[PDB]
Amino acid sequence: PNIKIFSGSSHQDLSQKIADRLGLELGKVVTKKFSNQETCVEIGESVRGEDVYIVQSGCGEINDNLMELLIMINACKIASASRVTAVIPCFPYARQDKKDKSRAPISAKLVANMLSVAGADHIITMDLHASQIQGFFDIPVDNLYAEPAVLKWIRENISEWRNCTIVSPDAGGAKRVTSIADRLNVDFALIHKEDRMVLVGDVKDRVAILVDDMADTCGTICHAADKLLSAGATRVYAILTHGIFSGPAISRINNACFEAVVVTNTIPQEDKMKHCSKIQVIDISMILAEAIRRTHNGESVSYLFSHVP
Amino acid sequence: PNIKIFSGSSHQDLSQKIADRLGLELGKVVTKKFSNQETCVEIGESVRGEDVYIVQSGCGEINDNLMELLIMINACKIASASRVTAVIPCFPYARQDKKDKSRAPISAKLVANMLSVAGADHIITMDLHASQIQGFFDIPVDNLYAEPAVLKWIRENISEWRNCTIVSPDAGGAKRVTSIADRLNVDFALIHKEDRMVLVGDVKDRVAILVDDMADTCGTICHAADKLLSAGATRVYAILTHGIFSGPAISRINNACFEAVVVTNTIPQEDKMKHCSKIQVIDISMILAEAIRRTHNGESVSYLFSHVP
Amino acid sequence: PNIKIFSGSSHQDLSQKIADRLGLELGKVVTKKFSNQETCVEIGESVRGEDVYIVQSGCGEINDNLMELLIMINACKIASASRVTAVIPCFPYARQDKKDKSRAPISAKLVANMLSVAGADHIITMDLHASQIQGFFDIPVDNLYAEPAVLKWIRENISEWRNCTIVSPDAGGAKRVTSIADRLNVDFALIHKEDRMVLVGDVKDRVAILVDDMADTCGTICHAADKLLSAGATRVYAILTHGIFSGPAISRINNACFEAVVVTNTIPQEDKMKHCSKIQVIDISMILAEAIRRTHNGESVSYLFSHVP
Amino acid sequence: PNIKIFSGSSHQDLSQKIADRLGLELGKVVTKKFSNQETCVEIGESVRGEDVYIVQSGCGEINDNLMELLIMINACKIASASRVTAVIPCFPYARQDKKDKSRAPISAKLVANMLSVAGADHIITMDLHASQIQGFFDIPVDNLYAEPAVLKWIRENISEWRNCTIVSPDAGGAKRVTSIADRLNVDFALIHKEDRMVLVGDVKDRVAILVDDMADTCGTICHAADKLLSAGATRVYAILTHGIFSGPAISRINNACFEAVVVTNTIPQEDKMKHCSKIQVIDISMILAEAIRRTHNGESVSYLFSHVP
Amino acid sequence: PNIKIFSGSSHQDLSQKIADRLGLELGKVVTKKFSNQETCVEIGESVRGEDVYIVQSGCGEINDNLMELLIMINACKIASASRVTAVIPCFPYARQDKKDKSRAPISAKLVANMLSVAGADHIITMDLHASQIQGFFDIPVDNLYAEPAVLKWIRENISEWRNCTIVSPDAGGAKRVTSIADRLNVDFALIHKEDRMVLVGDVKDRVAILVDDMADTCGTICHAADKLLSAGATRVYAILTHGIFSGPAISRINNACFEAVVVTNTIPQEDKMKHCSKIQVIDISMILAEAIRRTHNGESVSYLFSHVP
Amino acid sequence: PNIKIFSGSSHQDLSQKIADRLGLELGKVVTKKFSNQETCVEIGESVRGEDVYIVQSGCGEINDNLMELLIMINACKIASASRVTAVIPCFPYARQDKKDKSRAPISAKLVANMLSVAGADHIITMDLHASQIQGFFDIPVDNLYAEPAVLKWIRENISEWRNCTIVSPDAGGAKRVTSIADRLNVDFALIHKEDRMVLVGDVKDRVAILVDDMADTCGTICHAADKLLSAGATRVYAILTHGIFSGPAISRINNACFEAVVVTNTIPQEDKMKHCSKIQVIDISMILAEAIRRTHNGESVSYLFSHVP
Ligand SMILES: O=P(O)(O)OC[C@H]1O[C@H](OP(=O)(O)OP(=O)(O)O)[C@H](O)[C@@H]1O
Ligand SMILES: O=P(O)(O)OC[C@H]1O[C@H](OP(=O)(O)OP(=O)(O)O)[C@H](O)[C@@H]1O
Ligand SMILES: O=P(O)(O)OC[C@H]1O[C@H](OP(=O)(O)OP(=O)(O)O)[C@H](O)[C@@H]1O
Ligand SMILES: O=P(O)(O)OC[C@H]1O[C@H](OP(=O)(O)OP(=O)(O)O)[C@H](O)[C@@H]1O
Ligand SMILES: O=P(O)(O)OC[C@H]1O[C@H](OP(=O)(O)OP(=O)(O)O)[C@H](O)[C@@H]1O
Ligand SMILES: O=P(O)(O)OC[C@H]1O[C@H](OP(=O)(O)OP(=O)(O)O)[C@H](O)[C@@H]1O
Ligand SMILES: [Mg+2]
Ligand SMILES: [Mg+2]
Ligand SMILES: [Mg+2]
Ligand SMILES: [Mg+2]
Ligand SMILES: [Mg+2]
Ligand SMILES: [Mg+2]
Ligand SMILES: [Mg+2]
Ligand SMILES: [Mg+2]
Ligand SMILES: [Mg+2]
Ligand SMILES: [Mg+2]
Ligand SMILES: [Mg+2]
Ligand SMILES: [Mg+2]
């Protein structure tokens, strides 16, 4: 069985980068819409007995991309692929992970069920919003971390990183920032709202680094940056693995006081970078390519949790 | 257990009509989008131990409506509804029912699987494109027919209906037109392409009635009407249960020679009727309401196959 | 269908209380061990067509209790009970909810799968460690909150509760304490370690109230109380819904500086209260009885989230 | 894919022997208990793409061992092992194979379901109490027989084996003893109770050999030996594949009249042999190692049914 | 929901008797064959929301009857029956319950799986060949016993029944005969082959009663009767719940020395009674009717295990 | 059948509270007067096959409220409600329960007869003036007690309640005060007139608690309080379930020496509390809601006699 890399419509640049780092060409697939807005998927090459990897991120027009992904998975499954893996850098509906005193659907579980019934045997994703989403599946799920690439960017871009601070925008981000701080050996502050917020950890004359999993409307990071500047921090950085940047996000970032908003390219950012000069992008295509290659060859994937390939 | 009728965003008028004919109010549900194009569903009333019916048609923005439908089904299922029924007047992806020498997904089967895994116990639909789609499910599926309402419209709108002709636009429509002709006791012609088409059945000075399940781009009915006028038919009618009317459909119908294009309101048509004066709408909300009420009360549903309620 | 309440061996007092508040007698079941440590379960009364509720908490000898619970569920399922509900006040293996950079099993998902395959149709539990565990099941799960009873105890036991403070022992407890503070209209502090910990929120001359979901070894609450007394708080309270109290817990609580350690009786505490004079117990059997009765009668269960029955 | 052998806590000696006969080292796994009696399993080596075999016998603290086994299976399954096999020399709850006019659970079926849902693809077991338990699974089950090793022991340990007798302790043991007698070409007696028992088959001055699948409380074999000595048999032997030896078993065997109680090491017997001088152990680790190796290499496993490796 | 009783083609007399004892008419169903030997099933009445019971015995042309049964179950399931129960007085392939050192299918498990996937929610059967077959299903299975009717026949037909003997034809029949003997308070003999057989239990001048679950080729009962007459028993009786009577059975019974071969009407016997004057039939339709009625009304079914209705 | 709660004009606040505690909306009913003072009742929703509860208290303009109640009962009865229950917290004409040497009507019996002939199937009332009024009906009557709520108020409002006294204003109130005293374990005094009255029971320096069923003109409680202060009691309390407060009542209470006059909200008191600062109100809407819910669900209602819901 050989690796076949297929791209959805959501993130073609990421898929091309991944295929480049594997020494492959993207699989021949036509993904369009009929006139009635129905997804049309045609696999243009035989995938019989192959190790198929479909790259599709939960971004853009989310329901359309998810439908395309499910249809591609099912097409490869009934075309007798030996194994079908969904490479989903940003997991759709990941924030619908709990009910919490509401008659709300756990939409992430529904997405996991639909991926399972489409025929996915393996999920590769990056920085799941909640790790418990791994339990929503009955198939193996590899949850990669952008932390190696984030630390690399911090070291090569913040000259004052030995005295800097790693700040979480909310309580739920504590573990990630603590890990980052430990690997950098730096002090780590915290922030949480009460319309007011409290920041704990000395930041005066010290660079603050907000680290968080995603920014959708950028209310969280903007409030955090406001408070960080209240406490007299010199410069403020925001680092995110998923730059959804929806709605008022670009205006808020433009009107905010960040020195940089760094995001990983799990979501295409070219358009967002057009209208916001302070957005920078970390390439994580090497981590995804390495994970695909290691799952194919049966090598350890947890090695990546601590090493940049 | 009491009937609860919930509406999706796709066809709110149809749901309101159905709820009216059942003497009920639509269930309290909020269906919106987050900023990142993610479906948000909130059931505003307890459905515990109730007989929930969700009305949503595979029209408009199809993937968005299907995602909303699945999310609503799952929300009602994990909110402890006794039974959840998906009322899907136009089944999405119904035309993806077969592979036919292509590495194509059978998307209708995938939709059936997703409806099953969301937790639907019953499907009510109208004029499935292929009856074999009933076999795609492991739950009961009630496939209603618009034929009663169609015959009623023909009798009350075509004064020459005793001498008229019932014509199929393609080979695959033969059974429906034969049934219509038998119930009307009229001659039935046929049409099939060869860029040329052949029409069999005397139509000169006789009204032709094209009857078909759906019109998406209206190429089929337009070519059929062209040939019918070649054979000297006096007036031409098109009757359809699903008026998708996507892409060039409205321009084609406006430039065509139909005396009327009649569709059933399984899909909202107000906007299409705005730009096409020859589209008429048959109400089928009574058939849907009667089917919902008969499934709830355990009465025979196959009774509707031959009787207008 | 009538309510049948069955008790496991884990918490017989709680089951008797629940049956009392429902006006019922506990179902006739023999639960013993064979000589080879194998669970023997014998339902002594017909459950055919009944609404069976099995009360068993993930406490004591956990694997034995879980096996007994699964065996009872399966026995009632193949004895033709109409519906089987597992009332699990403390969910076993709930802390194994994620992998987090380790080749660790998500044991909570395995427990959910085993409960599903034994034949449980409904789960009633109290204060799940992670709400995402609700997504581990495909059946409905009712996750009750001890917050109503906790607020009642605080108001009737802490005369200074209008000026008091609600403190979380770790970051992951933020939401619960914020809800408690909002319903009491009090200031809410926070605590997190760095061997050192930082406390945010004025507590001098003010009573601190640690609120947390469980205490297993009581390291978390003991460190939190140490820091709270460092910041000069007058008296310190710990409130918990699950008092596992395993290992060095009783000695730590005896050597600690709590004014009271209050727990809810989701786990039997008679033995622990024998060796620790500062443990108090909140009865939550009324919430469980009300939830059982409301699920049986089809009434709203989410009503309990805000009201003491 | 390479063989990985993992040991549970139940029978570490058997697992070490099996790994020795395969030329392997036991896989690196930590299996302990948290303070609250919860099973903790940590796979210390990557099993990605490997052929994992977990050795765990339904002995000792049975529910704890079964939970450990299920947790290990699930851990290896979601760690992307190519195939997971449960090597279960003594199947837990095997005697709960039928209902038989009681509202009793078929606990063996529940255990099979839990093994399936944990993710086991293959079961290797020895001398199932009922062969129909193979039908409880939907995965392949290899049910090895200790008969080759038993015949070897009889021939090398009973000098009078050509004139001896093979006796069943109950009716349900008839097939096994008949097979043993046929392979030895000896007369076979039978025993069954009526507090009295009847023995059929001449045994005077002839050695009797009780052969049975398991001895739990040793009431069956002790009553059989009593009757055999009533009929004037010279010496009495008991041979068993599973020596559970629970409760009053050791005292009964010490007070009985056996010349030897021979058991196979599907269960650890060191402790039991400490307090009973007449217990002897047949090694069956070679049969288990050969079965593991033959399933891995795709060679015939049914070959072992008649040949000692 | 009301009881609907449907008959297959296998045993129409039994179904009519059952419907009579329930005060019902048999449901309107057409069960025929197309020209190509394909089963055609048409439910002639609505079963929507009803409690459907399909009576079909594993007799006659077994594969044809089983296919008809599965097709009827599926037809009633997708016709929206509330609950479908398969009343299978003689379970097909019940003797294929184990592998036993052969690459043989466990066909009984396959039949259980097919019944489950057709949509059966409940199985009612009589005297399963192995009780472990109840574990082959994941749905409830009621395994009725003919013992009440057998004891009634013995008491009303064998005037010497207080001094008689209850004999098992093989080892595997021990439990049934022991139960019969206990309820009659009589001595119980046993028989097993070695071409020779041994009988244990005094039978001289005493009537022997062979009791067994089924007679297929009647080799077992004929050899048992031969040995019983060797031991000087006065008269010999054979009692069976399933009279398959295939192949040389009728000639063997005619040439044998039975005073009577009594069978229960789980299989039609009119044709067999035509060519064998010593076959008598016990009606068990009352037990089946009582079980159907008690499962419908939610009353105890295990009551029948000891009482003739 | 579902619960329908309808409010009369007498006590709309109580009905809204009851509907809130049942999770319902008040039924749509228009209750007005024509110009000629005639009651107009229009049920605005179908009550066919429903469980109708009409809440109306014998207060305010009593004859008008009673006529409205009877008209509503009759309207729901001839609108085919399955069952109609009159929830009458204060029973009108309850004090006309006997003749007693006068040509007086037993008006309470007449009211019971009119309620029966209007079509009421069930009466729920609170603290009937005479229990024998239950015998005036031939339908079931549930006579709830305010004693649980009264004891709760006493314990949470009179800090000296362990040494207090429970005093009856007249002889006819003996049973109620004795029950209250027994549940509180306190001494109970008594009072009865001779223009003079005698008080029995030590009250010096002890709080006296007058407990009585109703206060109409408050002559009884005012004379009792006068005597209690004659005997040197420190503070005096009056507790009543029905605060009619007609005529000179408010002036008498204002000029009296009560520390508090506590009443239950069986009658609206907002207007009376406007002109009397010492009137406090106990909510009993939870008892009424619980009784309605328990009668609907068939649960025990006599449970409430001893427990606050
Ligand atoms: O839309 P934005 O203002 O950019 O906010 C996005 C936030 O949503 C998620 O947090 P969530 O609110 O789910 O809290 P949690 O991380 O504690 O679950 C995530 O951690 C981001 O902080
Ligand atoms: O987009 P339009 O030009 O309006 O055509 C829509 C056609 O699609 C379907 O037919 P299909 O081509 O699937 O053939 P079939 O009915 O024989 O399957 C349907 O019967 C319509 O005739
Ligand atoms: O054994 P103890 O010292 O009593 O600690 C028990 C802790 O375990 C859980 O927290 P966890 O460590 O899982 O963190 P989380 O709540 O943030 O997930 C729980 O919230 C308790 O605080
Ligand atoms: O606890 P002990 O006295 O050692 O008895 C253990 C017995 O249990 C099993 O027989 P079972 O009673 O299940 O009968 P069966 O073999 O006929 O099913 C097994 O065959 C042993 O003989
Ligand atoms: O075809 P016949 O000669 O009439 O034999 C039929 C026999 O088959 C079954 O026994 P089986 O051989 O399966 O043994 P068991 O009952 O011990 O399983 C059954 O108990 C009958 O005795
Ligand atoms: O109008 P008021 O001065 O407030 O009096 C109202 C009194 O009427 C009732 O007593 P009743 O006189 O009927 O005597 P009884 O309770 O002994 O029947 C009731 O018990 C009150 O005590
Ligand atoms: Mg969140
Ligand atoms: Mg967050
Ligand atoms: Mg087609
Ligand atoms: Mg067509
Ligand atoms: Mg945790
Ligand atoms: Mg915590
Ligand atoms: Mg047995
Ligand atoms: Mg045995
Ligand atoms: Mg057999
Ligand atoms: Mg047999
Ligand atoms: Mg009076
Ligand atoms: Mg009075």
CSV table of N, CA, C and O in Angstrom, one decimal, chain D residues 162-217:
chain,number,residue,atom,x,y,z
D,162,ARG,N,-2.0,-48.3,31.0
D,162,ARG,CA,-2.6,-49.1,30.0
D,162,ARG,C,-3.8,-49.9,30.5
D,162,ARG,O,-4.7,-50.3,29.7
D,163,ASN,N,-3.9,-50.1,31.8
D,163,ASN,CA,-5.1,-50.8,32.4
D,163,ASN,C,-5.9,-49.8,33.2
D,163,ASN,O,-6.9,-50.2,33.9
D,164,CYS,N,-5.6,-48.5,33.3
D,164,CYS,CA,-6.2,-47.5,34.1
D,164,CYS,C,-7.6,-47.2,33.6
D,164,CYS,O,-8.1,-47.8,32.6
D,165,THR,N,-8.3,-46.3,34.2
D,165,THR,CA,-9.7,-45.9,33.9
D,165,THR,C,-9.7,-44.4,33.9
D,165,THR,O,-9.1,-43.7,34.7
D,166,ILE,N,-10.5,-43.8,32.9
D,166,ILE,CA,-10.7,-42.4,32.8
D,166,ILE,C,-12.2,-42.1,33.2
D,166,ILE,O,-13.1,-42.5,32.5
D,167,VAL,N,-12.3,-41.4,34.3
D,167,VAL,CA,-13.6,-41.2,34.9
D,167,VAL,C,-14.0,-39.7,34.8
D,167,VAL,O,-13.2,-38.8,35.0
D,168,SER,N,-15.3,-39.5,34.6
D,168,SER,CA,-15.8,-38.1,34.6
D,168,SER,C,-16.5,-37.9,35.9
D,168,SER,O,-17.2,-38.7,36.4
D,169,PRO,N,-16.3,-36.7,36.5
D,169,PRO,CA,-16.9,-36.4,37.8
D,169,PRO,C,-18.4,-36.1,37.6
D,169,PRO,O,-19.2,-36.3,38.6
D,170,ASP,N,-18.9,-35.6,36.5
D,170,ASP,CA,-20.3,-35.4,36.3
D,170,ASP,C,-20.6,-35.8,34.8
D,170,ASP,O,-19.8,-36.2,34.1
D,171,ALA,N,-21.9,-35.7,34.5
D,171,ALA,CA,-22.4,-36.0,33.2
D,171,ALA,C,-21.7,-35.0,32.1
D,171,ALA,O,-21.4,-35.5,31.1
D,172,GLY,N,-21.6,-33.7,32.5
D,172,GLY,CA,-21.2,-32.8,31.5
D,172,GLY,C,-19.7,-32.9,31.0
D,172,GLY,O,-19.3,-32.3,30.1
D,173,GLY,N,-19.0,-33.8,31.7
D,173,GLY,CA,-17.6,-34.0,31.3
D,173,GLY,C,-17.4,-35.2,30.5
D,173,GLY,O,-16.2,-35.6,30.3
D,174,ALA,N,-18.4,-35.8,29.9
D,174,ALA,CA,-18.3,-37.1,29.2
D,174,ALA,C,-17.4,-37.0,28.0
D,174,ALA,O,-16.5,-37.9,27.8
D,175,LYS,N,-17.5,-35.9,27.2
D,175,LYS,CA,-16.8,-35.9,25.9
D,175,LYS,C,-15.3,-35.9,26.1
D,175,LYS,O,-14.6,-36.6,25.4
D,176,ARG,N,-14.8,-35.1,27.0
D,176,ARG,CA,-13.4,-34.9,27.3
D,176,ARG,C,-12.8,-36.2,27.7
D,176,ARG,O,-11.7,-36.6,27.2
D,177,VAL,N,-13.4,-36.9,28.6
D,177,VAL,CA,-12.9,-38.2,29.1
D,177,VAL,C,-12.9,-39.3,28.0
D,177,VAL,O,-12.0,-40.1,27.9
D,178,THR,N,-14.0,-39.2,27.2
D,178,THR,CA,-14.1,-40.2,26.1
D,178,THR,C,-12.9,-40.0,25.1
D,178,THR,O,-12.3,-41.0,24.7
D,179,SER,N,-12.6,-38.7,24.8
D,179,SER,CA,-11.5,-38.5,23.9
D,179,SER,C,-10.2,-38.9,24.5
D,179,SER,O,-9.4,-39.5,23.9
D,180,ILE,N,-10.0,-38.6,25.8
D,180,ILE,CA,-8.8,-39.1,26.5
D,180,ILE,C,-8.6,-40.6,26.5
D,180,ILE,O,-7.6,-41.1,26.1
D,181,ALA,N,-9.7,-41.3,26.8
D,181,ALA,CA,-9.7,-42.7,26.8
D,181,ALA,C,-9.4,-43.3,25.4
D,181,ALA,O,-8.6,-44.2,25.3
D,182,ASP,N,-10.0,-42.7,24.4
D,182,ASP,CA,-9.8,-43.2,23.0
D,182,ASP,C,-8.3,-43.0,22.6
D,182,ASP,O,-7.7,-43.9,22.1
D,183,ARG,N,-7.7,-41.8,22.9
D,183,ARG,CA,-6.3,-41.6,22.6
D,183,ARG,C,-5.4,-42.5,23.4
D,183,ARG,O,-4.3,-42.8,23.0
D,184,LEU,N,-5.8,-42.9,24.6
D,184,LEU,CA,-5.0,-43.9,25.4
D,184,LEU,C,-5.4,-45.3,25.2
D,184,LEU,O,-4.7,-46.2,25.6
D,185,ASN,N,-6.6,-45.6,24.6
D,185,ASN,CA,-7.1,-46.9,24.4
D,185,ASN,C,-7.3,-47.6,25.8
D,185,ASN,O,-6.6,-48.6,26.1
D,186,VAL,N,-8.2,-47.0,26.6
D,186,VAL,CA,-8.4,-47.5,27.9
D,186,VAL,C,-9.9,-47.5,28.1
D,186,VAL,O,-10.7,-46.9,27.4
D,187,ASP,N,-10.4,-48.3,29.1
D,187,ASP,CA,-11.8,-48.2,29.5
D,187,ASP,C,-12.1,-46.9,30.3
D,187,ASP,O,-11.2,-46.4,31.0
D,188,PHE,N,-13.3,-46.4,30.1
D,188,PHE,CA,-13.7,-45.2,30.7
D,188,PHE,C,-15.0,-45.4,31.5
D,188,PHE,O,-16.0,-45.8,31.0
D,189,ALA,N,-14.9,-45.0,32.8
D,189,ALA,CA,-16.0,-45.1,33.7
D,189,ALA,C,-16.7,-43.8,33.7
D,189,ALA,O,-16.3,-42.8,33.1
D,190,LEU,N,-17.8,-43.8,34.4
D,190,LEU,CA,-18.6,-42.5,34.6
D,190,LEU,C,-19.1,-42.5,36.1
D,190,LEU,O,-19.3,-43.5,36.7
D,191,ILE,N,-19.4,-41.3,36.5
D,191,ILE,CA,-19.9,-41.0,37.9
D,191,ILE,C,-21.0,-39.9,37.8
D,191,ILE,O,-20.8,-38.9,37.1
D,192,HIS,N,-22.1,-40.1,38.5
D,192,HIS,CA,-23.0,-39.0,38.7
D,192,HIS,C,-23.8,-39.2,39.9
D,192,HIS,O,-24.1,-40.3,40.3
D,193,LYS,N,-24.1,-38.1,40.6
D,193,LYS,CA,-24.9,-38.2,41.8
D,193,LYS,C,-26.3,-38.5,41.6
D,193,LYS,O,-26.8,-38.3,40.4
D,194,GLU,N,-27.0,-38.9,42.6
D,194,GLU,CA,-28.5,-39.2,42.5
D,194,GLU,C,-29.3,-38.1,43.2
D,194,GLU,O,-30.4,-38.4,43.7
D,195,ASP,N,-27.7,-37.3,47.7
D,195,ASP,CA,-26.4,-37.2,48.3
D,195,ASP,C,-25.5,-38.4,47.9
D,195,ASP,O,-24.3,-38.5,48.2
D,196,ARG,N,-26.2,-39.4,47.2
D,196,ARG,CA,-25.5,-40.5,46.7
D,196,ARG,C,-25.1,-40.4,45.2
D,196,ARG,O,-25.7,-39.6,44.5
D,197,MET,N,-24.1,-41.1,44.8
D,197,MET,CA,-23.6,-41.2,43.5
D,197,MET,C,-23.5,-42.6,43.0
D,197,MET,O,-23.2,-43.5,43.8
D,198,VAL,N,-23.6,-42.8,41.7
D,198,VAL,CA,-23.4,-44.1,41.0
D,198,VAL,C,-22.2,-44.0,40.1
D,198,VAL,O,-22.1,-43.0,39.3
D,199,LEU,N,-21.3,-45.0,40.1
D,199,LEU,CA,-20.2,-45.2,39.3
D,199,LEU,C,-20.4,-46.4,38.4
D,199,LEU,O,-20.8,-47.5,38.9
D,200,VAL,N,-20.3,-46.2,37.1
D,200,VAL,CA,-20.4,-47.3,36.1
D,200,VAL,C,-19.1,-47.5,35.4
D,200,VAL,O,-18.4,-46.6,35.0
D,201,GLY,N,-18.7,-48.8,35.4
D,201,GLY,CA,-17.4,-49.1,34.8
D,201,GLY,C,-16.5,-49.8,35.9
D,201,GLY,O,-16.3,-49.3,37.0
D,202,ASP,N,-15.9,-50.9,35.5
D,202,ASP,CA,-15.2,-51.7,36.5
D,202,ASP,C,-13.9,-51.0,36.8
D,202,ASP,O,-13.1,-50.6,36.0
D,203,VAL,N,-13.7,-50.8,38.1
D,203,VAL,CA,-12.5,-50.1,38.7
D,203,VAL,C,-11.7,-50.8,39.7
D,203,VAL,O,-10.7,-50.3,40.1
D,204,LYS,N,-12.2,-52.0,40.2
D,204,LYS,CA,-11.5,-52.7,41.2
D,204,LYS,C,-10.1,-53.1,40.8
D,204,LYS,O,-9.9,-53.5,39.7
D,205,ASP,N,-9.2,-52.8,41.7
D,205,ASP,CA,-7.7,-53.0,41.5
D,205,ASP,C,-7.2,-52.2,40.4
D,205,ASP,O,-6.0,-52.3,40.0
D,206,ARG,N,-8.0,-51.3,39.8
D,206,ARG,CA,-7.6,-50.4,38.7
D,206,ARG,C,-7.6,-49.0,39.1
D,206,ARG,O,-8.4,-48.5,39.9
D,207,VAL,N,-6.5,-48.3,38.6
D,207,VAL,CA,-6.4,-46.9,38.9
D,207,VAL,C,-7.5,-46.1,38.2
D,207,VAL,O,-7.8,-46.3,37.0
D,208,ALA,N,-8.2,-45.2,39.0
D,208,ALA,CA,-9.2,-44.3,38.4
D,208,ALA,C,-8.5,-43.0,38.2
D,208,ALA,O,-7.7,-42.5,39.0
D,209,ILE,N,-8.9,-42.3,37.1
D,209,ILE,CA,-8.4,-41.0,36.7
D,209,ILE,C,-9.6,-40.1,36.5
D,209,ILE,O,-10.2,-40.2,35.5
D,210,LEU,N,-9.9,-39.3,37.5
D,210,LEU,CA,-10.8,-38.2,37.3
D,210,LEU,C,-10.3,-37.2,36.4
D,210,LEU,O,-9.2,-36.7,36.6
D,211,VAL,N,-11.0,-36.8,35.3
D,211,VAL,CA,-10.6,-35.8,34.4
D,211,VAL,C,-11.8,-34.8,34.3
D,211,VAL,O,-12.9,-35.2,34.1
D,212,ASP,N,-11.5,-33.5,34.5
D,212,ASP,CA,-12.5,-32.5,34.5
D,212,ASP,C,-11.9,-31.2,34.0
D,212,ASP,O,-10.7,-31.0,34.1
D,213,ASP,N,-12.7,-30.2,33.6
D,213,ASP,CA,-12.2,-28.9,33.2
D,213,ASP,C,-11.8,-28.0,34.3
D,213,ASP,O,-10.8,-27.3,34.1
D,214,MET,N,-12.5,-28.0,35.4
D,214,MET,CA,-12.0,-27.1,36.5
D,214,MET,C,-12.4,-27.6,37.8
D,214,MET,O,-13.3,-28.4,37.9
D,215,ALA,N,-11.7,-27.1,38.8
D,215,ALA,CA,-12.0,-27.4,40.2
D,215,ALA,C,-12.1,-26.1,41.0
D,215,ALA,O,-11.0,-25.4,41.1
D,216,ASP,N,-13.2,-25.6,41.4
D,216,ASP,CA,-13.4,-24.4,42.1
D,216,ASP,C,-13.4,-24.6,43.6
D,216,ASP,O,-12.4,-24.1,44.3
D,217,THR,N,-14.4,-25.3,44.1
D,217,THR,CA,-14.4,-25.6,45.5
D,217,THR,C,-14.1,-27.1,45.7
D,217,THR,O,-14.1,-27.5,46.9
